[PDB]
Amino acid sequence: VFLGFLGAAGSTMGAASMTLTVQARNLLSGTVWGIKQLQARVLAVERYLRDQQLLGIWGCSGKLICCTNVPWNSSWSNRNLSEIWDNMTWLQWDKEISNYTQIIYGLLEESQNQQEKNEQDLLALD
Amino acid sequence: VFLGFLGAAGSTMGAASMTLTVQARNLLSGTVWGIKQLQARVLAVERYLRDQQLLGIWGCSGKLICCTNVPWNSSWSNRNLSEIWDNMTWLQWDKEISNYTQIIYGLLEESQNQQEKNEQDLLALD
Amino acid sequence: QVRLSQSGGQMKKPGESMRLSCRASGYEFLNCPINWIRLAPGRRPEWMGWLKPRGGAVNYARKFQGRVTMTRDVYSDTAFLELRSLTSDDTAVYFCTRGKYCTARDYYNWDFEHWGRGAPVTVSVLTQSPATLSLSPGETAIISCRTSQSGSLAWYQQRPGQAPRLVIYSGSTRAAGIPDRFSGSRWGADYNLSISNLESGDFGVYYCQQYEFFGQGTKVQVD
Amino acid sequence: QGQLVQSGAELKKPGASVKISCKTSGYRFNFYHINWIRQTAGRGPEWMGWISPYSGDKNLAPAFQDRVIMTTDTEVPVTSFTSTGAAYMEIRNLKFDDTGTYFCAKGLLRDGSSTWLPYLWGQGTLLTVSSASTKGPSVFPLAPSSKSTSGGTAALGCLVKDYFPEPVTVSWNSGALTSGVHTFPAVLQSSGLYSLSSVVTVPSSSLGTQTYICNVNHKPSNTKVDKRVEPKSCDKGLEVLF
Amino acid sequence: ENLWVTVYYGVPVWKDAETTLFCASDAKAYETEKHNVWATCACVPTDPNPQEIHLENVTEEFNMWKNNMVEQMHTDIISLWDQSLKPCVKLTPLCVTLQCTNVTNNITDDMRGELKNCSFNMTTELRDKKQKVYSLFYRLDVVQINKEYRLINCNTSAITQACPKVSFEPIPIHYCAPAGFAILKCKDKKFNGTGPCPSVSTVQCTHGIKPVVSTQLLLNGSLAEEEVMIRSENITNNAKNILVQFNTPVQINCTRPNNNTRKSIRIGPGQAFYATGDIIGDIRQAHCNVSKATWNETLGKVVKQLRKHFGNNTIIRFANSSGGDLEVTTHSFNCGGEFFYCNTSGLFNSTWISNNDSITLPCRIKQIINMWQRIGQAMYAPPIQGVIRCVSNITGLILTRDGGANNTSTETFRPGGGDMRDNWRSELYKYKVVKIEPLGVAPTRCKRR
Amino acid sequence: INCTRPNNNTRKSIRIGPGQAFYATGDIIGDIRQAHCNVSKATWNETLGKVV
Ligand SMILES: *[C@@H]1O[C@H](CO)[C@@H](O[C@@H]2O[C@H](CO)[C@@H](O[C@@H]3O[C@H](CO[C@H]4O[C@H](CO[C@H]5O[C@H](CO)[C@@H](O)[C@H](O)[C@@H]5O)[C@@H](O)[C@H](O[C@H]5O[C@H](CO)[C@@H](O)[C@H](O)[C@@H]5O)[C@@H]4O)[C@@H](O)[C@H](O[C@H]4O[C@H](CO)[C@@H](O)[C@H](O)[C@@H]4O)[C@@H]3O)[C@H](O)[C@H]2NC(C)=O)[C@H](O)[C@H]1NC(C)=O
Ligand SMILES: *[C@@H]1O[C@H](CO)[C@@H](O[C@@H]2O[C@H](CO)[C@@H](O[C@@H]3O[C@H](CO[C@H]4O[C@H](CO)[C@@H](O)[C@H](O)[C@@H]4O)[C@@H](O)[C@H](O[C@H]4O[C@H](CO)[C@@H](O)[C@H](O)[C@@H]4O)[C@@H]3O)[C@H](O)[C@H]2NC(C)=O)[C@H](O)[C@H]1NC(C)=O
Ligand SMILES: *[C@@H]1O[C@H](CO)[C@@H](O[C@@H]2O[C@H](CO)[C@@H](O[C@@H]3O[C@H](CO[C@H]4O[C@H](CO)[C@@H](O)[C@H](O)[C@@H]4O)[C@@H](O)[C@H](O[C@H]4O[C@H](CO)[C@@H](O)[C@H](O)[C@@H]4O)[C@@H]3O)[C@H](O)[C@H]2NC(C)=O)[C@H](O)[C@H]1NC(C)=O
Ligand SMILES: *[C@@H]1O[C@H](CO)[C@@H](O[C@@H]2O[C@H](CO)[C@@H](O[C@@H]3O[C@H](CO[C@H]4O[C@H](CO)[C@@H](O)[C@H](O)[C@@H]4O)[C@@H](O)[C@H](O[C@H]4O[C@H](CO)[C@@H](O)[C@H](O)[C@@H]4O)[C@@H]3O)[C@H](O)[C@H]2NC(C)=O)[C@H](O)[C@H]1NC(C)=O
Ligand SMILES: *[C@@H]1O[C@H](CO)[C@@H](O[C@@H]2O[C@H](CO)[C@@H](O[C@@H]3O[C@H](CO[C@H]4O[C@H](CO)[C@@H](O)[C@H](O)[C@@H]4O)[C@@H](O)[C@H](O[C@H]4O[C@H](CO)[C@@H](O)[C@H](O)[C@@H]4O)[C@@H]3O)[C@H](O)[C@H]2NC(C)=O)[C@H](O)[C@H]1NC(C)=O
Ligand SMILES: *[C@@H]1O[C@H](CO)[C@@H](O[C@@H]2O[C@H](CO)[C@@H](O[C@@H]3O[C@H](CO[C@H]4O[C@H](CO)[C@@H](O)[C@H](O)[C@@H]4O)[C@@H](O)[C@H](O)[C@@H]3O)[C@H](O)[C@H]2NC(C)=O)[C@H](O)[C@H]1NC(C)=O
Ligand SMILES: *[C@@H]1O[C@H](CO)[C@@H](O[C@@H]2O[C@H](CO)[C@@H](O[C@@H]3O[C@H](CO)[C@@H](O)[C@H](O)[C@@H]3O)[C@H](O)[C@H]2NC(C)=O)[C@H](O)[C@H]1NC(C)=O
Ligand SMILES: *[C@@H]1O[C@H](CO)[C@@H](O[C@@H]2O[C@H](CO)[C@@H](O)[C@H](O)[C@H]2NC(C)=O)[C@H](O)[C@H]1NC(C)=O
Ligand SMILES: *[C@@H]1O[C@H](CO)[C@@H](O[C@@H]2O[C@H](CO)[C@@H](O)[C@H](O)[C@H]2NC(C)=O)[C@H](O)[C@H]1NC(C)=O
Ligand SMILES: *[C@@H]1O[C@H](CO)[C@@H](O)[C@H](O)[C@H]1NC(C)=O
Ligand SMILES: *[C@@H]1O[C@H](CO)[C@@H](O)[C@H](O)[C@H]1NC(C)=O
Ligand SMILES: *[C@@H]1O[C@H](CO)[C@@H](O)[C@H](O)[C@H]1NC(C)=O
Ligand SMILES: *[C@@H]1O[C@H](CO)[C@@H](O)[C@H](O)[C@H]1NC(C)=O
Ligand SMILES: *[C@@H]1O[C@H](CO)[C@@H](O)[C@H](O)[C@H]1NC(C)=O
Ligand SMILES: *[C@@H]1O[C@H](CO)[C@@H](O)[C@H](O)[C@H]1NC(C)=O
Ligand SMILES: *[C@@H]1O[C@H](CO)[C@@H](O)[C@H](O)[C@H]1NC(C)=O
Ligand SMILES: *[C@@H]1O[C@H](CO)[C@@H](O)[C@H](O)[C@H]1NC(C)=O
Ligand SMILES: *[C@@H]1O[C@H](CO)[C@@H](O)[C@H](O)[C@H]1NC(C)=O
Ligand SMILES: *[C@@H]1O[C@H](CO)[C@@H](O)[C@H](O)[C@H]1NC(C)=O
Ligand SMILES: *[C@@H]1O[C@H](CO)[C@@H](O)[C@H](O)[C@H]1NC(C)=O
Ligand SMILES: *[C@@H]1O[C@H](CO)[C@@H](O)[C@H](O)[C@H]1NC(C)=O
Description:
part of a larger assembly, 6 chains, D: mainly beta, seven-stranded mixed sheet, elongated, E: mainly beta, 4 helices, 30 strands, 9% helix, globular, binds a molecule of 7 linked components (NAG-NAG-BMA-MAN-MAN-MAN-MAN), binds a molecule of 5 linked components (NAG-NAG-BMA-MAN-MAN), binds a molecule of 3 linked components (NAG-NAG-BMA), immune system
């Protein structure tokens, strides 16, 4: 089944995790009044490289999905495994986690690939 | 400790190697007089993709740090391991190596991933 | 600053016609409509009409259709009104008003935050209670207004001999310069304005308003 | 994390039908199933069936396969993630063993192996199937009595005598006086009529400062009684305080 | 048992925002050429096979009165008008004294002239000898001064003549969003235009919306579904306009029975003014026809929808405009290059209680206009040769309600307008712009060693 | 420093149409005075003595 772009918006997060390769595909898409689209598609590629930079400096690089060594803080809406992927949409989840997105981002770019890669540099010399 | 953007500029290279994820984060940052900033953030993203292209064609791709199979030529300011990371700043080091940066770049983009990946092409078929 | 400068009052005879002007300043005249409202002593305020300076669009109350003519001069930012076939019923103080919310994007006409000085012209629902309220300084006055339609309700204060001042809008939101002593509440169709710690300035007559409709008024006097 | 309110208790004669509603609010009505579970005093807890508001698919128990109809209204959006809806059920061919409490329950999850599992429940609607006709209650005022002489407390109330069938709701001053109100369950007399009592413990100093009006409501007979409990007591142990 | 964060890229997560929209206007419209008509010059061709993805289970809230696409389209059309009038001939030395007289005709005294036969001086190609030429202007274009007249816009702003190469023909323009954004579309048959929408779909480019600039009567718009629609930001507020959308279009015919001549007088070197020559035929005035039966059924279908908001058993009376400028009191529009201002007193003259020909309307014509309440730029519409005939669709109205009622159960509605943004709100009510945020974190039993 | 223009002036809006308008200076209401600037003697002394 292929619901299309933004297809599984009202479905659970577990169900919407199957449509990751659909919203990612149509995210980049390949005299005045003609500069209207130029400045827009320039901000479009700046927004794309912005997200790609965040996805790269973290422990992912490989897009779509990646795991991390970060303990899930109970204060970030303490929910259960079966209460998130089978009872909540991505919009409803982002509405709750909007307070802690920047904190987690800081715990992802700094605490991980800056201490993990240096650890590998210490593990790869021997 | 987080000295901030350009924090460890006067610190040793070994100490400044801990602040790699700080200068990399703030490197991209997300009628006339309005095109003044447009042409600037366009050169900003061209400078970013330029460095990312050099970082990609080499044996790195994964940013921050990466190792290479290139012997350190003594003519490139023959210093010791403890005389570089514990007695020299990055500005002072780049001032000396400015003559050989382009040579090393040539020995990194050509000699490595062009002969190494083809070697893997011969090693991955069996 | 937004300032509405009105021409003075006048004495007319029955059968004649009258003309009033109101020059707006301090804002973009085209952004939002100017209104004309008549207030007769001891009578429910009557909204006469509005004009959008952009295009000169107008809207007249039923009572006045065929008698009133509203125009404007965009260059001098001046709004003009004419009223024909004057009868004794027309004796009143005529005001030009402008709403509080008035930007380029949109507006809200009926929160009358800006009022002209008024023009006294002599020619010769919303249930508000109580009619009068005699209280001492320090007490609390509770004025009530019953609606049947609901929607952003406002409370205005008129001091003896001064133009009414916007006190509350949206039933519970204070205007600029209104202290905490003034507070609004709502229960179903009922609206209550509560004024705590009465003082000399608070005394006057208060009106509830829902769009163009006004209450009969409540006179709060010092005893 | 919502709220389910059902209709009032009704009295139905055997052979007729009855439609019990269940209005929901505080969540998306279409994202969870609506189970209907009953409970009688002879067969214990019994699951009747469920219905999914999105499609309209239903799954009834074989025992209620040929006499229960489940219907659901459309969702009325309130916010982007919460809403208000209403589900109904119509049980026909009523018998004597159908007397009990009927509950409506919200589903547990949206996907998985326990999507329809009853999680959030209602308050329940008592259904009585009897031939005996509806009889109105007889409210009698209960005279205040002395509870503590040194404490200065008393207790007054109302007496709902001879009513059928259950239940009867009693409030005080249109729901203004709620503290200290103790409503006791009714008694099953030999005739088959019920009778309960309500009593509120109040200080003795309150006489001309509070009006005591007990509001007895009996919807099956469509009758409401507002009794003015006289504050003047007759207990000799309380008259000393007055 | 302990959950672990996992980054997901490409999740259906969007938020309401405002961005820079670009255009789209098919591929056959670009073949219309004629030295870039209206706007389509460097516009992106519309995708031959557009895709509209119906977002199942999705209920999204729209707000036609707080939508930014309307303001963007308005400023876009304004900038379009300026860029279209920048390289045209400026009529700076045209405010000379006009010795005008009546047009050659034969009475009565109630014909009030309307057309004036003005004689005046003009600068030729050389900067020496002048030029005694005559033209024919409308009364709305001239004004006497103390018979000697002058152009009505002398002591207001400058004036530029519209170039005869370009056209003011409204062509469908698709507004599209750049990468990372999307346009939500409400696809319910009864969306009265505010609040949650049950059936929401996503699109990249909207349908062809023709920028028809008109007042009072919405021309060439989108028909409503089933029952006619009534939209208002605040119904109890009589100061907010009431946009009415029709289901069945009302056939209107407007004609200019004055097939005219274009005199090409030369204000050299280079520039050339197009005056109005003599009229071939009879002296007739422009007019508009509205089918009596169609207007009756449309009005009777609208009044039945008006009673659903102002009480079931009420009287709805229709009256025409109360007064003001000509652009508000009359049906202002463009047809064939000419700017008509028609009398809409025969359409809004009725009184509906709780329970075979054409209606002709007198239309005036103005050449010097100042639309969008703009001061600084006055455009002279060049005369158009031949009888102009146009058939359009009345697909909606812009009404205003009379206030200070209190007493009485009747409500009176009058034609309004002025703000041209309302003309765009009648087509952008079912669209809204959202930004995609594909970065979403979520806990699951995943880690490394 | 305090600078004043003791010549509160009138703006005549003469019209060089069509469109343009020149703002000339009308009559002066009051006394014919010239603009001037004050500098506190003590402050100027301490500042100069601190600079030298
Ligand atoms: C497009 O069409 C759609 C239809 O699809 C449409 O949406 C409905 O619009 C109609 C109007 O025609 C609505 O019906 C009205 O609702 C008005 C608003 O109700 C809100 O406000 C109530 C008051 O809140 C204040 O007061 C309480 C108590 O003091 C206070 O606590 C709060 O803080 C708040 O300050 C509020 O109580 C009401 O809440 C009840 O209702 C919702 C359902 O609407 C319900 O789900 C809740 O559980 C709660 O029970 C709601 O939040 C409203 O004022 C009005 O009632 C007044 O007027 C009628 C007479 O007309 C009187 O009978 C009455 O006494 C009131 O004075 C009426 O009920 C409806 O709300 C809309 N639906 C939705 C989902 O929003 C659009 O309007 C159409 N648009 C256009 C342009 O035509
Ligand atoms: C809109 O939101 C609604 C919810 O309100 C969604 O509808 C539910 O969708 C889920 C899927 O996530 C449903 O659950 C599955 O029901 C299937 C029913 O199967 C029959 O019907 C299909 C379709 O006609 C047939 O092709 C199949 O042949 C069957 O005849 C079951 O097969 C499922 O159980 C099986 O799969 C699950 C795992 O998926 C296992 O756990 C089970 O053990 C079993 O192997 C499952 O029960 C549900 O039926 C839908 N609701 C309704 C009312 O039907 C929509 O998905 C949502 N919209 C979008 C676009 O997602
Ligand atoms: C709008 O108003 C303008 C004036 O402001 C008009 O333009 C004028 O129209 C009149 C017609 O009524 C013109 O008068 C005609 O001029 C002709 C030009 O001929 C020239 O050459 C001959 C030699 O061959 C000279 O003798 C003559 O003086 C000219 O220099 C004449 O030939 C015409 O004469 C003919 O008609 C008359 C009519 O009575 C007969 O009596 C004659 O015998 C002969 O047949 C006539 O005199 C005038 O020239 C126009 N002026 C300009 C500047 O164009 C419009 O007519 C008016 N429009 C409307 C609709 O009212
Ligand atoms: C609206 O007003 C305009 C005003 O310009 C009128 O346009 C003129 O109309 C007349 C009449 O139709 C045209 O005169 C016609 O001229 C034809 C020859 O023209 C060519 O040749 C000459 C040289 O001889 C060139 O100068 C010219 O440029 C052309 O190349 C004749 O052949 C015509 O006669 C034929 O047609 C008529 C019907 O039209 C028949 O009755 C005849 O028997 C014959 O078959 C005719 O005389 C004139 O050319 C038009 N001018 C312009 C600029 O277009 C419109 O007619 C008028 N319309 C209405 C509905 O009122
Ligand atoms: C600097 O120079 C400017 C030159 O313009 C002076 O501005 C003028 O000052 C005079 C004096 O204050 C003003 O005259 C005042 O007119 C008021 C009425 O004006 C309104 O009503 C008329 C119609 O009657 C309208 O045409 C007009 O537009 C206004 O809407 C009177 O009420 C004033 O009298 C009151 O104030 C004076 C003190 O100012 C008292 O002595 C009186 O007793 C009375 O209380 C007054 O006559 C004039 O309007 C000003 N013109 C402009 C354009 O502003 C400055 O005053 C001057 N300043 C200094 C410091 O020199
Ligand atoms: C320059 O072009 C302008 C167009 O933009 C012209 O402005 C308009 O001119 C008309 C007259 O042709 C005015 O309409 C009249 O207004 C008067 C107002 O009377 C009152 O004011 C005068 C002057 O102060 C005073 O003498 C009287 O006693 C009154 O106190 C009405 O009485 C008339 O009936 C008529 O409506 C417009 O108001 C005016 N402005 C606008 C925005 O339309 C202007 O006239 C042109 N210049 C010249 C020199 O004619
Ligand atoms: C050319 O001009 C003449 C002269 O004005 C026009 O004649 C006029 O025609 C009108 C219309 O019929 C006459 O008005 C009449 O007034 C009387 C008054 O009692 C009324 O009873 C009639 O019903 C009519 O309304 C007017 O008297 C008449 N003038 C003259 C001098 O005869 C004529 O119509 C114009 N056109 C043509 C082609 O002649
Ligand atoms: C506008 O003009 C058209 C064209 O003349 C009219 O349509 C005609 O209507 C009559 C009567 O129904 C028919 O006999 C013709 O066959 C129609 N012709 C065409 C081309 O459609 C239309 O009725 C007019 N409408 C108004 C309001 O005047
Ligand atoms: C500039 O003007 C201000 C205002 O008149 C002067 O400040 C005043 O100074 C006197 C003397 O110290 C005080 O009594 C006033 O209270 C001050 N007023 C204010 C508003 O500050 C200031 O001295 C002047 N300076 C010069 C150089 O002329
Ligand atoms: C977890 O949340 C708590 C409370 O919000 C906070 O004290 C703690 O710092 C959070 N953990 C991290 C790693 O930020
Ligand atoms: C489940 O939720 C509860 C309540 O917030 C919490 O105590 C528990 O840690 C959660 N468990 C999991 C596995 O998320
Ligand atoms: C967001 O943070 C604010 C500030 O502490 C708080 O009021 C709010 O409850 C938080 N929301 C969520 C969803 O955590
Ligand atoms: C290293 O540098 C020395 C001296 O400059 C030179 O002889 C040698 O060829 C260089 N080798 C490499 C690999 O750069
Ligand atoms: C120090 O540098 C010299 C000269 O190149 C070399 O002989 C020696 O091996 C280096 N020692 C270390 C510890 O790097
Ligand atoms: C750079 O190269 C030039 C040219 O050979 C030389 O003069 C200079 O010493 C070199 N500098 C360094 C730091 O190697
Ligand atoms: C007018 O519209 C505003 C904006 O949605 C709303 O808050 C208000 O309740 C509306 N008024 C009425 C009377 O519906
Ligand atoms: C036309 O001629 C008549 C008669 O001299 C005159 O009164 C009128 O002003 C002229 N102009 C118009 C437009 O009627
Ligand atoms: C221009 O107008 C004047 C008006 O004084 C007139 O004398 C003259 O003949 C006209 N024509 C030319 C070419 O000057
Ligand atoms: C409206 O019609 C009336 C006659 O009923 C007329 O006096 C007025 O000029 C007309 N107004 C407009 C704007 O056409
Ligand atoms: C429009 O028509 C009406 C009715 O015939 C008339 O009273 C009014 O004066 C006309 N308006 C104009 C501007 O001609
Ligand atoms: C306008 O209405 C006519 C009459 O039915 C129709 O033929 C034509 O297609 C319509 N134009 C549109 C919808 O653009």
